[PDB]
Design a protein around this ligand. Structure first.
Ligand code: 7FA
Ligand code: TB
Ligand code: TB
Ligand code: TB
Ligand code: TB
Length: 674
């Protein structure tokens, strides 16, 4: 879990700059330098401010504590003192891995303008810092400042609580959290200050703080290790709950495989193959087709062989609604299908009417009053909730553990592409796959520090997560320039950290309206299926693209290729790209088996059910508008005429059912893996 490492002492000295651009109006520059260390977030150093020189010589020197095991980046920058805010003229980030100890380095930086600096890394005889590392994330050692009381402003630069300001005068107290390696000071006022040297055993300290006019206040100070246990779990292993669930699930899979594969005997847990559903995004189109694919899997008695179930964007809408009912996979799916169809067909002129807009901004004001940022994504959560359901829907990701108690459904993995890193959400845990940093979903949204929970916030209604998962907007045709105006005008009158806040990295490791980067709209949920502990043996890949039905998979090949993860090569023949078919097999024989299901209208044209010719009365049922203009399944569109909904759903149901042979074939093969 932990690691003891000694800090070094970096002594940087700022010598001179040369060729400093002037101020406007022929005035020469009044310059100074500022040093900030990436891994010392609250702290600044600042050189004297010289006057009217384009070749200024400060020759001052400052001191830091550098933890060798963390990635330390020094941002040093020259400003012109403006008598407004000061205009920057030179900035340069410098990784101080380069700088070796004992060896004195001189550097010159440039990006005309030149700045000369001298570093010296010196050993030191402080005790080693006590880290908690993941070999890619590091939690720096903390310490805590208990302050007892017998218009007070306590300030401690470098501390999660920057400045605390209390008003009572009858037995109050305060805690500050801050790194041990910070050289800093507590400052009190009604400006006396107490130094805080780094990495020492703290003593008791009293200070009398003068009132300006009246008698004085007393304060007891102790510095200690922190009391709080790490709320964030750092690791590249599956959590206990997931592990527990795997057993719980694996048996119902063997019980369900035996009938589907008409098997000789019962299976031991260690031989049960791990099968995953892997859905891509695609708005309303992805949602309804997915319902259909699930329907097929239920009818074939195969949905009960599925251990994991992952999705992105639209797929998650299907997923979230289904997991609301804690036993959806056992009950009739045509209930939820009907729900989806009706709400999809309901016209959405209401969702942008000022009665509803009121209730959004009213929930945003209520939301703003509580500890909450106002982001566009939070509004998108409210309108999406309003389209997807008629009303507020009071369900929560934690609540979906209901659906897993007895291994009665697969484990839902909602994947989310952030500003780029992948964030996976399960009812058990949520976090960054790249950093092996995870929390349980209740705490998602809460305020954190250095891997410790600082303020617990109420777990949010799932639609706010669905917006994260299916966000379509940047940080900034004729149909939807009008609700835009309706919204903007109703909303007139109107910074957000995550649970990683504080954590650090281990060393050895024109304006737009929507998102546009292709990553957001073209990937499958592979990352979830390839997380460290999961060992997937079969993947059913559902793809909801209307062109490029193999791009998302090739992305995955690439992804796994770059991480030394076994994965079969997706090389579809020229014929396959042009007119693909309902199911494609792929297959380093330790790599998962992969059945890929394009969104294609192939044999469904003239078959009403697997193996059955289409009657001329139902011919229209097989014609599905997946190409050509006025196709109703465009990503834009979020009202599907009940007729259109059905075509796509049945196509999807069919495409899977009609591929029953290959699935069963694949499952047999997965069994003989071991
Ligand atoms: P996922 O599959 C998510 C796809 C979502 C597409 C749905 C499109 C909806 C159009 C409605 C927009 C609401 C308007 C919001 C406000 C914008 C204008 C403000 C001035 O992606 C991978
Ligand atoms: Tb001047
Ligand atoms: Tb200034
Ligand atoms: Tb300016
Ligand atoms: Tb880009």
């Amino acid at each position: 879990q932990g690691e003891a490492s000694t800090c070094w002492q970096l002594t940087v000295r700022v010598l001179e700059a040369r060729n400093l651009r002037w101020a406007d109006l022929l005035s020469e520059a009044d310059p100074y330098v500022i040093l900030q260390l990436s891994t010392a977030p609250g702290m600044k150093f600042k050189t004297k401010t010289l006057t009217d020189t384009s070749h200024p010589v400060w020759n001052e020197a400052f001191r830091f504590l550098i933890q060798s095991q963390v990635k330390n980046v020094l941002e040093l920058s020259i400003y012109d003192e403006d008598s407004t805010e000061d205009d920057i003229c030179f900035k340069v980030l410098y990784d101080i891995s380069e700088v070796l100890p004992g060896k004195l380095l001189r550097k010159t930086f440039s990006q005309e303008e030149e700045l000369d600096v001298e570093f010296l890394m010196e050993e030191t005889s402080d005790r080693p810092e006590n880290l908690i590392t993941n070999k890619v994330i590091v939690a720096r050692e903390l310490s805590c400042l208990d302050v007892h009381l017998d218009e007070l402003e306590l300030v401690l630069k470098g501390s999660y609580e920057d400045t605390q300001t209390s008003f009572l005068g009858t037995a109050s107290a305060f805690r500050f959290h801050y790194m041990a390696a910070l050289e800093t000071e507590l400052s009190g006022r009604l400006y006396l200050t107490v130094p805080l040297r780094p990495l020492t055993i703290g003593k008791e300290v009293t200070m009398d703080v003068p009132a300006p006019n009246a008698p004085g206040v007393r304060l007891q100070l102790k510095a200690e290790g922190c009391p709080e246990e790490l709320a964030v779990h750092l690791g590249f292993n599956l959590c206990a709950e997931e592990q527990a669930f795997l057993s719980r699930r694996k048996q119902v899979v063997a019980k369900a495989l035996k009938q589907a594969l008409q098997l000789d005997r019962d299976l031991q847990e260690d031989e049960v193959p791990v099968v995953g559903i892997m859905a891509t995004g695609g708005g309303a189109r992805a949602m309804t087709s997915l319902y259909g694919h699930l329907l097929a899997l239920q009818k074939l008695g195969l949905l009960d062989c599925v251990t994991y179930f992952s999705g992105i964007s639209g797929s998650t809408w299907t997923m979230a609604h289904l997991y609301g009912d804690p036993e959806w996979s056992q009950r009739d799916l045509e209930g939820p299908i009907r729900y989806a169809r009706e709400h999809l067909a309901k016209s959405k002129l209401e969702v942008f009417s000022p009665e509803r807009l009121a209730s959004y901004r009213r929930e945003l004001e209520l939301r703003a009053e509580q500890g909450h940022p106002t982001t566009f994504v939070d509004l998108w959560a409210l309108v999406l909730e309003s389209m997807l359901h008629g009303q507020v829907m009071d369900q929560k990701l934690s609540g979906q553990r209901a659906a897993l108690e007895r291994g009665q459904n697969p484990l839902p993995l909602y994947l989310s592409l952030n500003v780029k890193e992948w964030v996976e959400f399960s009812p058990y845990e949520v976090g960054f796959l790249k950093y092996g940093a995870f929390v349980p979903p209740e705490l998602f949204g809460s305020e954190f520090f250095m891997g410790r929970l600082m303020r617990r916030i109420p777990e949010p209604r799932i639609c706010f997560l669905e917006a994260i998962w299916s966000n379509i907007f940047s940080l900034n045709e004729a149909s939807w320039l009008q609700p835009g105006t309706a919204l903007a005008q109703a909303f007139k009158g109107f910074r957000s950290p995550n649970f990683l806040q504080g954590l650090q990295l281990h060393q050895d490791y024109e304006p737009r309206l929507c998102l546009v980067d292709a990553a957001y709209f073209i990937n499958t949920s592979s990352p979830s299926m390839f997380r460290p502990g999961r060992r997937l043996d079969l993947i059913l890949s559902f793809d909801y693209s209307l062109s490029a039905p193999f791009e998302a998979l090739q992305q995955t090949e690439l992804y796994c290729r770059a991480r030394g993860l076994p994965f079969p090569r997706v090389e579809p023949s020229p014929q396959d790209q042009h007119q693909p078919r309902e199911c494609h097999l792929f297959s380093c024989p330790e790599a998962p088996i992969l059945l890929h299901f394009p969104l294609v209208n192939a044999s469904f044209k003239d078959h009403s059910a697997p193996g059955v010719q289409r009657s001329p009365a139902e011919l229209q049922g097989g014609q599905v508008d997946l190409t050509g203009a006025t196709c109703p399944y465009t990503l834009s569109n979020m009202t599907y005429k009940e007729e259109d909904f059905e075509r796509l759903l049945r196509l999807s149901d069919y495409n899977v059912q009609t591929s029953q042979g290959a699935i069963l074939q694949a499952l047999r093969t997965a069994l003989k893996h071991r």
